[PDB]
């Protein structure tokens, strides 16, 4: 006997992508070599984000990029391991160069129209193997419809599952002191 609390405990994070895209398999091979034989911490972070599922790689927008292109960051390279989306509100698009997993049709057109350049994760490794002069970005993880229903309960101000919304669907008892109590 050995009197241990835990035994044969597995890891908690993905160690390989669950997707079977052939091109993505090549991209993992490249960065798996780079991370092993380079001291730059930028390579290790990029490798893990390639494994993540779609809900853990939310899209980023052109507006969110322009937000972080201020206060002395107008000359750096934006790297986004996700999709990049055009924003209809932004009327004037600044000049930037972006390395992203994929672009929408309109986002690619508007970036190069202003005088920018659209890169690729493989071309990024060819130009900046150590990731110098780069900034990483993420999308809003919690900006999803399904997250609003998480942890429903009294005094929590969450969203309920209703087949429709109106005065006939819930409200009533338990939502106003005029009928019993409130939550």
């Amino acid at each position: 006997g050995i009197d241990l609390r835990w035994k044969h405990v597995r890891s908690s994070h993905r160690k390989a992508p669950k997707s079977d895209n052939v091109y993505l398999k090549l991209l993992v091979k490249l960065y798996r070599f780079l991370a092993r034989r380079t001291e730059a911490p930028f390579n290790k972070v990029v490798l893990r984000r390639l494994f993540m599922s779609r809900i853990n790689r939310p899209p980023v927008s052109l507006s969110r990029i322009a937000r972080n292109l201020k206060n002395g960051n107008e000359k750096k390279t934006v790297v986004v391991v996700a999709t990049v989306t055009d924003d209809n509100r932004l009327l004037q698009v600044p000049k930037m160069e972006v390395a992203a997993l994929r672009f929408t049709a309109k986002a690619r057109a508007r970036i190069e129209a202003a005088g920018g350049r659209t890169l690729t994760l493989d071309q990024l490794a060819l130009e900046k193997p150590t990731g110098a002069n780069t900034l990483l970005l993420r999308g809003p993880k919690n900006a999803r419809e399904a997250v609003k229903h998480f942890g429903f309960g009294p005094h929590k101000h969450k969203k309920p599952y209703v087949r429709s919304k109106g005065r006939k669907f819930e409200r009533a008892r338990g939502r106003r002191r005029s009928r019993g109590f409130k939550v």
């Binding site: 006997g1 050995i2 009197d3 241990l4």
Partner: protein, 149 residues
Amino acid sequence: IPPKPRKILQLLRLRQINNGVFVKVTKATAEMIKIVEPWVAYGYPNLKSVRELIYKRGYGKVNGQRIPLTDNAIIEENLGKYGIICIEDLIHEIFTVGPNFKQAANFLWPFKLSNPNGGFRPRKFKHFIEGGDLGNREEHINALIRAMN
């Protein structure tokens, strides 16, 4: 085993039968040992016993792994910053309680000993005074180490 004495044995790194560790006696640790009386036997080592244990059963914790110590390069790589570079320094630090005793003792993996050669007493779960084997026996623990080592 009751829940409180079990937790103390976990903090002393004694999770298996016939294990052994070095501890320096203070008021903070003397009370911990007195709680787990009917589970352990302890005493005062001499120069030979500490010397034999390190040479024959000496293993070191390196990156969370049990690496047998057979070359001086292993000891220096992990205890060099405290001034210990050889296996004679490790023995000196343990035997004469030194300023860096805590790091030296925690480096050693808990010792694993075999059953004693001559056997125990007729009933080995009384106190040493009554005629058993568990408890404090002062210098008489050297004889027990010879058999179990």
